[PDB]
Amino acid sequence: TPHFDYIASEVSKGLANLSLELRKPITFGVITADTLEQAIERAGTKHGNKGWEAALSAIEMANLFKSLRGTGGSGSSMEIYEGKLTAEGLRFGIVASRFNHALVDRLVEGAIDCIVRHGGREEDITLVRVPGSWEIPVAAGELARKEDIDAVIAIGVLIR
Amino acid sequence: TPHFDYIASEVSKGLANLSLELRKPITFGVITADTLEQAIERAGTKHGNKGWEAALSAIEMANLFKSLRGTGGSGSSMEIYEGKLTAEGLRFGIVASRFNHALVDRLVEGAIDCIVRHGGREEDITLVRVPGSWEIPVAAGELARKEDIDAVIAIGVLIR
Amino acid sequence: TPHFDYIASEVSKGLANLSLELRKPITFGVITADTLEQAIERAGTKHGNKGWEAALSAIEMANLFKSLRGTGGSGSSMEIYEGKLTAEGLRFGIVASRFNHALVDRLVEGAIDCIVRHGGREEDITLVRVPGSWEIPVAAGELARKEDIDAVIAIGVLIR
Amino acid sequence: TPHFDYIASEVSKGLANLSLELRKPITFGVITADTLEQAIERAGTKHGNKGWEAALSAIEMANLFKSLRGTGGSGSSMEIYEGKLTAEGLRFGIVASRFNHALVDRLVEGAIDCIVRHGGREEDITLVRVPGSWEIPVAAGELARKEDIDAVIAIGVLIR
Amino acid sequence: TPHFDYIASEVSKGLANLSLELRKPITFGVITADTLEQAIERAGTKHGNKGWEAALSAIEMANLFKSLRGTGGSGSSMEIYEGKLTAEGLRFGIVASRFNHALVDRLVEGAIDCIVRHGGREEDITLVRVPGSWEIPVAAGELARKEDIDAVIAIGVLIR
Amino acid sequence: TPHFDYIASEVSKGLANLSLELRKPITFGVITADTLEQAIERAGTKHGNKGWEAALSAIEMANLFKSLRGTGGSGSSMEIYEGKLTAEGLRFGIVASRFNHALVDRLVEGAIDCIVRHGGREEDITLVRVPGSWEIPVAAGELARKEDIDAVIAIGVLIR
Amino acid sequence: TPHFDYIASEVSKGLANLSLELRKPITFGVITADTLEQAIERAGTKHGNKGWEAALSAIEMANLFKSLRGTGGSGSSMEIYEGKLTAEGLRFGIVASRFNHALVDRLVEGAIDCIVRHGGREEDITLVRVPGSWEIPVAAGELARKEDIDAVIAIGVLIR
Amino acid sequence: TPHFDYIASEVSKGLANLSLELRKPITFGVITADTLEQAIERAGTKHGNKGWEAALSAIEMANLFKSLRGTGGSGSSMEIYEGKLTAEGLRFGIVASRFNHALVDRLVEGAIDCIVRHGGREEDITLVRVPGSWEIPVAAGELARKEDIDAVIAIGVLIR
Amino acid sequence: TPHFDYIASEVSKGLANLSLELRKPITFGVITADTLEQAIERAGTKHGNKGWEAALSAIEMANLFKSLRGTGGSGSSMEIYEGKLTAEGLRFGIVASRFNHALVDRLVEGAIDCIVRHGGREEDITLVRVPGSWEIPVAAGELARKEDIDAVIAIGVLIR
Amino acid sequence: TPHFDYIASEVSKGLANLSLELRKPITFGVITADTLEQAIERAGTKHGNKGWEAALSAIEMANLFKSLRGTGGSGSSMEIYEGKLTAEGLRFGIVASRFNHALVDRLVEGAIDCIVRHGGREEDITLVRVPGSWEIPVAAGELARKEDIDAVIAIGVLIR
Amino acid sequence: TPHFDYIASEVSKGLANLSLELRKPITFGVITADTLEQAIERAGTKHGNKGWEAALSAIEMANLFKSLRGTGGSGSSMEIYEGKLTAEGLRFGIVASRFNHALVDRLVEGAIDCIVRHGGREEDITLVRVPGSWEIPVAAGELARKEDIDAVIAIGVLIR
Amino acid sequence: TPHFDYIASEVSKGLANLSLELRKPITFGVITADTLEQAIERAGTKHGNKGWEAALSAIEMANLFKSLRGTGGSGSSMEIYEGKLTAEGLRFGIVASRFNHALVDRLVEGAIDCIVRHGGREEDITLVRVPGSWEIPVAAGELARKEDIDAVIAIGVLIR
């Protein structure tokens, strides 16, 4: 049914505009699959875990923004900016939906595992749960406005 | 005819932007079906009632936002935010269209039934009717700006 | 040709955003047909007149907004807001395109007929003509900003 | 390739939003064809010249806006606003792309021919050239902000 | 999978809006291919290098904007504005993604080669790397706000 | 039936010879279609209005003949003669048939609209109606012989 | 559509009768093609330029008529009359239509090139432009009646 | 017909031998297409302009030869020779054929545009025209022997 | 049989090298057809006369070379060299083969006709006949070395 | 096998260049057939003898060159040079290969028969035999450099 | 397209003649493939690296020529000349094109790797870059004429 | 692949030109086969040995050239020149490639066997080895210039 298309378009558009308005990194960890088999593939099976990948992107972006707003350094040569993959000292927020929870809970486990084994603390993670993917952008807007949050990770599953 | 696509795109886009601008929950209770049979399925028959589901999402989001803006509590561990399913003390607004009223009136009945049996009062419900789905976003904007409204529910039916 | 899609997307999007920004009703009276036969059907023939329907929606919305911004009344029960279908005292603006004028002039006749027989005056109607559908949103923006206009009706014909 | 779709969507969307923000007429003179033969048809051959048509729309819109912001006149009857097709005293800007220049230069010739034979002067035309269609909206934004420009004409060719 | 469409739509839309808001040139150097073979074709092989083309567009736009904001000159004739292809004295920023790095690094080489052989210095190039195409718009927003950057080049590869 | 061919041949031949004998411009505004759908296309719909086009040709020819019979001017270079598109001061005659009046009246409206918006007066238009296309040439001969008529426009519809 | 046949028949017939009545050479430089590809072939491509050929015929005919009306000479043998291909001292008029101008302007360039490189002057060429092929015969009649014109060249493009 | 093969073989062979004998750069800007559509593609349309590309090659080769015959410099490392893309101070000759002039004139425009916008002067360009591609090599031999010419550009169109 | 290919390759190659060695124009007037019908087409019938075309090329090249070796003139602008089509004062040589003489004699007639009617004298034409196409290059070498010959025309017919 | 092509190309090319370098006639009497039957046809059977034809060409060319280098004569009219078919006083050389000698010896007989019956002497014929067609050009070079040889005849047979 | 054939023929022919004229080794390291897949196969993948092979041939030829021009030695037996594969003391030049640089840079790496690991120095390698394969022969001619160069390596990629 | 054609064309062309320039016999002993089976057939199997055949041709040519440059003798009759098949006193050079050495070494054995059994000495044979067929012509040029070499034999194998 066409119900799939309109929800997917608005969730992706909402998160993108929000990141530019607040000038803070927000990572897209939402699965958009045509079949149930395709979704299981990406939820901790032969095609990996999308929750793990989204967390890794957030860590890099947080370090990159710390570098851009610093001194930068270097001189007499091309300046190159890049982000490390160390999570020590960073604080993260996660927004997850409850629909298709059999798959979503696998993605949330991956995101937490990535942060901890790269040097982060569970005490620095804030987790917010919403009833559906439609409510992710408005909930993400509340976390992104907090001063002590470095990046936000959005997780959900949509099946056509 | 392509008339279906343009109306559906603008209604979904309008409600999404409105929720982010006013920072208030708005739930998507609009059916978008390809055939008449598919619409009857979701209007109180073998595939459930979409009006009931939209009301349940609104109740949860209202409680969640009450929790985020409070003290929060907890410490020395991962903070988790979630919303209960009790409607005592909450105030709701509903916007419904008149086209395909044979189906829409079934969705409005479900939304009211959900609120009352979860502990709400009919005195706390405000209902606004508009001639069509195109007029839902502008009407929803008037309710969302009232200080004594906690969440808004949008209901409509579109058939290709 | 794909020329049809881009014009249709921008006209619908422009009018929708304009209504939310100015918080005034704007009705969508634009035909979007795949064949010439489908267009004649909706221009005063076996499938009705879209110009008549758009005017009827404008009258209802104007009365509804008068009711929301008033006292409202009622008490100890569910508040219900709805609009009458009387046009006495209301002032309307119309924006119409010149392309496919053989069909557009039938839609403009229907809109004027609806307003007059529901109790309106021709003296209270302002009509603006533009060369094409692409120019409708910018022209509609000038009328919507006038203080003595209650609603705007947009009329046009697009054929793939 | 899908490269065609994304460029076409952004160019049309950019020009539409720009016209509403600055409240000035901007005309869409961009060809969007599926085949090379379809493009030659509309570049000064059996299906006319799109550059000529875009210039004619600009002249009408400029006169219409002069009329709306004037006294208006009339009374005791329905007010009708329309634009003449005389270009005496008007000042125009043109933005043209360089890709597919074998066709684009035919469209620019048509636009200049239309303005001159309707009573305009070549001294009142400002022409800006950009490397591609993607750069049209940003260049059009510089011309539209000048106080002595009445309307802007955008010209380009895209082939799937 | 539909994952390709939503990412491509948001990246193109984000860059377009950013250029209009900041009124600075931003060039679209992102490949959007249906097959791996189509991508290799445009990454330094029989169909050229898209990184080279994007850099050439940036140089022209930078010179054009220098000309518009200057005196302009000329008189008693049609004013024509155009940009040279000399890069002496200009300063450029580049944002590149890490996904499909086997192809992306070919595009970055082309962009640097174009700038140097047209008269630019490597000391005037700032390069920022991001984990994926989704993060390009937010990173591009940081460079575009610097006062000593004349234009920004965005590079990435997406394969359906 | 072959009835279509003989009428069409004689009407076109009659008007052509008449223009050469009297040395005055006469424009061919007669539709010759194979199907009813083809005729509606050219009578104010997706393929334009033939009545508008015929009037535009008459205006140009009238100005051109005023220029040829004047001084001409210029020297030491190639002489070029062309006609403007201003209708101020010109006087026009129109001959229209009554068969297929549902379509013919759309063409007559277009011709009058073109003349007025290019600067002409309705007081300077003479309209003659004949029962059929066969009678157009003899009626056109009476108007063309008047001293105060600058050009004649012939309008009709023939369907095989 | 049969519209092509009637216009083509009248234009060819008009020019032929005009040449016999005034006893002056008139050359037929009008393309009559069934497809767009056939027209491009004869407008300066693999099948030559019809504008060049028409000018060459005019030069020969002008010299031939100068020879017939002279002494003739010769005796006691068969008299043979023929025309040279030198354009020194001759004066030419050209009538060209504006429809399908993308092709017509190529034919006019060829005609001027032929005259100049055979020894003629641009100062001796008079160029008249008309809105369409239907108006060519009446315009050609004005030039042919001038005493200082030796031959007339008619140029146009018609596509079925 | 086999006429295409023999002309193409001799033109390419002639230019190649000439460049080696005189030890001066000569660039191959001749289109060799199987169909008319393929030729239009490369004459300023979706596949670019071959005249522009040939001029760019000439500029690079001229700078490279200036570098080889100079000091060279560098030491204790691999010597690398390359040419810049600045045209300041260079002098160019162009040889163009007249057959298929509708396409050839587009290629000549591109070559001149490239030279001027890279810093060259029109005063430093010498243009020679020949009746056909067969005559290009002998004409190119006269320009290449002049002492004040740095490179030669050959332009033509051949269609099988 | 393959006999056709080897003769055609050597005749074309021989004439091309000869023109470069002696630096004198030589024109290729040899028909290379696959069928007898194709040859008759080009020997004075619906596809013209190749002997006429070859003579016209020789006249232009002779005038061009007279211009290059002269003063040239012009200044402060782009120098353009081109050849007139006047044959007064020029001297020509012709080499023709005897095989397929039924067709060759038609080509020789055309070449002589072209020269005389453009202003040349028959007294200035030298005609040499050889038994076959294989012997054309060696015979052409004797004429090209004479000081009082301006250009050479080669004529022959080969059929596969 | 492709062995046939390379030998045939080099033998024909070698003889052609040799004739131009030494400025002496050399005739091509080599059969190039696809099948054995085709070769027997041309070796003294229903399609004639190629050895006879090559000798006849040599006789004509020898007389022609005697005429060109003489006085020439004639005046006040077109000069025509041609060769007789008398062999009295001429001296000839023949180079023949040994491969396929069953056919080659028939060709050598024909060449000698032609010379004798046209008035030549066997005492004036020099015959050189080589092992194969590849060795013909080098052997022909030794004969052509002798002062008392007027023309050379090359004979061989190649079968694919 | 046939463009591939003519470029390939001239590049191979140019290098071959150059080696014989200067009597110095030149190696053919140019890939000529029908498909992109075939080219990747030979650019450092399952079918090896053509750049490595060309360098190995150059080393052997350089040693062989050193041996031929020396004493030679040996006696009373068959003399055999052969080249070692040691690169100590030799000096090499490389000419490489820029088109299809994604593949060409792999070939240049292989050539340098071969020379160094066989005992050569990077200080003894001269590298020249040209815009395309057409320019390789003229650039190779400049290196081959230097006294301190032992062999030249030509590298390029052409794809049909 | 087309790689086969270009190498084969240049090797055959190089050897042919070399023989004419130095006026010394050079024999073509290179196999050009389409399949591996065809090559084994000609390398000492059912279709003979090409190395043996090439040596036999060299012996004959060496004796023939000794006869031409001698007295010649004979008189009062047709002079006939031919070569014996005795190798006593003659000196030979051989150039062989290393690619496909499994087959090439069979051809070299045949060439040596032919010379010895016809009366030659192994002491009079000089053998030069090159890495590939491309290097044969340049190596053959060094041997052919030695005064004490009577003929050269070229051996190689190419497989499509």
Numbering used by the authors:
A (entry chain C), B (entry chain D), C (entry chain E), D (entry chain A), E (entry chain B), F (entry chain AA), ...: 3 to 162
List passages from the publication reporting this PDB structure.
The cpAaLS(84) assembly resembles the AaLS-wt cage, where each pentamer interacts with five neighboring subunits in a dodecahedral arrangement. The atomic model of the cpAaLS(84) cage revealed that all the constituent pentamers interact with each other in the same manner as in the AaLS-wt assembly. The 2-fold symmetry interface consists of a hydrophobic patch (L8, L141, and W137) surrounded by a hydrogen bond (H41) and ionic interactions (e.g., R40 and E5) while an α-helix region (120–131) forms 3-fold symmetric hydrophobic clusters (I121 and I125) in the cage interior. Irrespective of the tested buffer conditions, cpAaLS(84) did not exhibit substantial fluorescent changes up to 110 °C, indicating little protein unfolding.
As such, we found that a circularly permuted variant of a cage-forming enzyme, Aquifex aeolicus lumazine synthase, cpAaLS, assembles into a variety of hollow spherical and cylindrical structures in response to changes in ionic strength. Cryogenic electron microscopy revealed that these structures are composed entirely of pentameric subunits, and the dramatic cage-to-tube transformation is attributed to the moderately hindered 3-fold symmetry interaction and the imparted torsion angle of the building blocks, where both mechanisms are mediated by an α-helix domain that is untethered from the native position by circular permutation. While the wild-type protein, AaLS-wt, self-assembles into a ∼ 16 nm dodecahedral structure composed of 60 identical monomers,35 the negatively supercharged variants AaLS-neg and AaLS-13 adopt expanded 360- and 720-mer assemblies, respectively, constructed entirely from pentameric capsomers. Moreover, a circularly permuted variant of AaLS, cpAaLS(119), forms not only ∼24 nm and ∼28 nm expanded spherical cages, but also straight ∼24 nm-wide tubes of variable length. We previously designed two circularly permuted variants of AaLS and confirmed that their morphologies depend on the positions of the newly generated N- and C-termini. The native terminal amino acids were connected via an octapeptide linker using genetic fusion and new sequence termini were introduced either between residues 84 and 85 or 119 and 120, yielding cpAaLS(84) or cpAaLS(119), respectively.
